[PDB]
Write a protein that binds this ligand. Structure first.
Ligand SMILES: CC1=C(/C=C/C(C)=C/C=C/C(C)=C/C=C/C=C(C)/C=C/C=C(C)/C=C/C2=C(C)C(=O)CCC2(C)C)C(C)(C)CCC1=O
Length: 145
């Protein structure tokens, strides 16, 4: 990330894990119109295998699996994610978001609201250029774990 994007990324990593997940969901909704949907052109993608392992879990454990991706760990799902390239890692998150929209991954609860104190960060992200937001995501997903 560049000089203008580093502060936003650093703030993001300082939120609690649940807040990070929610912000990633809201970020997806904001970016979605300008994103090409997953999967990529390759069929045997390693990202699909990691997503598929998460999809096969109960919804509650899908949530725990996504929490563990941000927190880090050495379990099977973390290891599958950690072996991926940064763009493949981002593919997993994109597949998860698409799964939330098609009903195969646990969705954002209708009663959830962000903890107080996210307004400044979301305002700052809204001011970033599209290229800066792409670099934010590539750097953020690689830094998880
Ligand atoms: C006939 C003939 C010829 C003709 C040659 C011709 C016709 C040449 C034409 C060549 C063309 C059309 C090349 C296109 C390349 C596209 C690239 C690299 C796209 C990258 C996209 C990216 C990174 C996307 C990224 C992204 C993704 C995916 C998103 O999902 C959203 C974000 C973002 C947009 C950033 C010659 C000239 C050779 C000789 C003369 C002659 O007779």
């Amino acid at each position: 990330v560049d000089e203008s994007t580093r502060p936003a990324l650093e703030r993001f990593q300082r939120f609690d894990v649940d807040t990070q997940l929610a912000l990633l969901w809201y970020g997806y909704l904001d970016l979605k119109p300008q994103l090409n949907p997953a999967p990529p052109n390759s069929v045997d993608t390693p990202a699909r295998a990691v997503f598929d392992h998460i999809q096969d879990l109960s919804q509650q454990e899908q949530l725990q699996a996504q929490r563990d991706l941000i927190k880090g760990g050495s379990g099977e799902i973390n290891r599958g994610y950690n072996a991926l390239s940064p763009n493949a890692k981002l593919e997993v998150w994109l597949l998860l978001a698409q799964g939330m929209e098609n009903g195969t991954i646990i969705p954002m609860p209708s009663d959830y609201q962000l903890p107080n104190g996210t307004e400044e960060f979301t305002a700052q992200v809204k001011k970033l250029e599209f290229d800066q937001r792409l670099n934010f995501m590539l750097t953020a997903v690689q830094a998880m774990g």
